[PDB]
Amino acid sequence: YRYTGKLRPHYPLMPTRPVPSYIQRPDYADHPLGMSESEQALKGTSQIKLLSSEDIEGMRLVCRLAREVLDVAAGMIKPGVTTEEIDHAVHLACIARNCYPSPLNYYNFPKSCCTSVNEVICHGIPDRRPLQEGDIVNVDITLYRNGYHGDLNETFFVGEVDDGARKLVQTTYECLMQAIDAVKPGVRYRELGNIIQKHAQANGFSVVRSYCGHGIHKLFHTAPNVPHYAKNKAVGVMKSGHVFTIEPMICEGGWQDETWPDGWTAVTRDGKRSAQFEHTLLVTDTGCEILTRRLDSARPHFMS
C-alpha cells in the first residue's frame, strides 16, 4: 500500500473492549460480521420514518448523552495523548451513561469511536499514535440507549495550529451550520449540498462525495441519504418528525478519497487535510431542533 500523506497506522491495537451485559445492545453487536439485519431489511428504501412522541423523547435523551461523551473526549485533546486513550475514555463514558458505543462491532469496526487526524476524512481507527502539536483531529461519537442512536462529531486543534488549519476548520463548521439553518418542513434533502458546496468552494475547499449524512433513530444509518455536494439526486422532502444527520467533510485539496488496507480509514488521495462537523437534527413544525447541541456553552470546542 502506498500511503497518501505522512500518517501511518500505529499497531498493535488493544484487544476489543467488552461492554457489560446489563447495557442493551443493538442487533449488530452480536453478529459475527457486525451486520445489522434491521438496517439490511430496509436497504434501497427511501421512505422516511415519522417519529412518535415516544421516539422523540428517546432521541432527545440519547443525543444529550452523546454530546456529554463528545465533551469528555474534547477535554482530553492535548499533544502526546494517543487516540486509543481517547477511545478508552469514550468507552467508559458511554457505559457510565448506560449506553452502548454504537461504532463498536458495527460491520466489525474495532473501537468505540472514530478518530480522524489530518488527511483522514472519516472512520479513523484509534491506535497507538500520540497526537502532535499542529494536528487537527475529529472525534465522531454515537451512543445507543433504549433502542435509539444519537450521533455527533467535532474537529479539534492540537496545541497551536497553522492558519490553513484554522481556515479549514472554521469553514467546515460554517458549512454545517448554514445547512442546519435551512432545515424546515418542505425543504428538499438535496438542497443541503448546494448550500455546503457554495460556502466551501468560496473559501478554496472541496467537498467529499463518498460519505453522506443519514437518517438515524432505531437504526444507526437509514433513509434519508443526505449528500453534502451540489446538484445531487437525494430523494425526499423534509417533514416535521423526521430525524437525520448533516456531517460535511471538507478538504484543503481535492475531494477524492481512498480507503486504507484496514477497510475503514478514509483518506484524501492527495494527502492534504480534511475536517468535519456533525449534528443529529429533528425537523419540527416550523424549523429544527439540534438534538446534539451544547446546552451549556455558545460555541463548538475549537472556538472556546
- Rounded Cα distance between 212 and 247, Å, is 7
Site for Co ion contains 257 (CB under 5 A):
no
- Answer yes or no: is 247 a known binding residue: yes
Site for Co ion contains 151 (CB under 5 A):
yes
- Residue nearer to Co ion on the CB measure, 206 or 276: 276
- Residue nearer to Co ion on the CB measure, 69 or 77: 69
Give the rounded distance of the alpha carbon of 102 from its chain centre. Answer: 11
Site for Co ion contains 140 (CB under 5 A):
yes
- Residue nearer to Co ion on the CB measure, 34 or 201: 34
Min dist CB 278 to Co ion, Å, is 5
Min dist CB 247 to Co ion, Å, is 5
Q: Under a CB-based contact definition with an 8 Å cutoff, are residues 83 and 120 in contact?
A: no
- Residue nearer to Co ion on the CB measure, 107 or 132: 107
- Answer yes or no: is 285 a known binding residue: no
Site for Co ion contains 39 (CB under 5 A):
no
Site for Co ion contains 245 (CB under 5 A):
yes
- Answer yes or no: is 123 a known binding residue: yes
The beta strands (E) that lie in 205-248 are given as: 206-207, 213-215, 222-226, 243-246
151: partner contacted, choices K ion, Co ion, none (Cβ within 5-8 A by kind)? Co ion
Q: Which residue has the cell 462525495?
A: 209
Site for K ion contains 274 (CB under 5 A):
yes
Min dist CB 183 to K ion, Å, is 25
Helix (H, G, I), strand (E, B) or coil at 129: coil
Q: What angle do CA 234, 147, 76 make, to 5 degrees?
A: 85
- Residue nearer to Co ion on the CB measure, 84 or 140: 140
Helix (H, G, I), strand (E, B) or coil at 60: helix
- Rounded Cα distance between 135 and 165, Å, is 8
The number of beta carbons lying within 10 Å of the beta carbon of residue 161 is: 17
Min dist CB 91 to K ion, Å, is 21
Q: Which residue has the cell 453478529?
A: 31
116: partner contacted, choices Co ion, K ion, none (Cβ within 5-8 A by kind)? K ion
Helix (H, G, I), strand (E, B) or coil at 214: strand
The number of beta carbons lying within 10 Å of the beta carbon of residue 303 is: 11
Site for K ion contains 116 (CB under 5 A):
yes
- Rounded Cα distance between 104 and 221, Å, is 14
- Residue nearer to K ion on the CB measure, 176 or 282: 176
Q: Which residues are documented as binding site?
A: 123, 140, 151, 214, 221, 247, 278
**Residues lying near K ion in the complex (CB under 5 A):** 116, 120, 274
**Residues lying near Co ion in the complex (CB under 5 A):** 140, 151, 153, 245, 247, 278
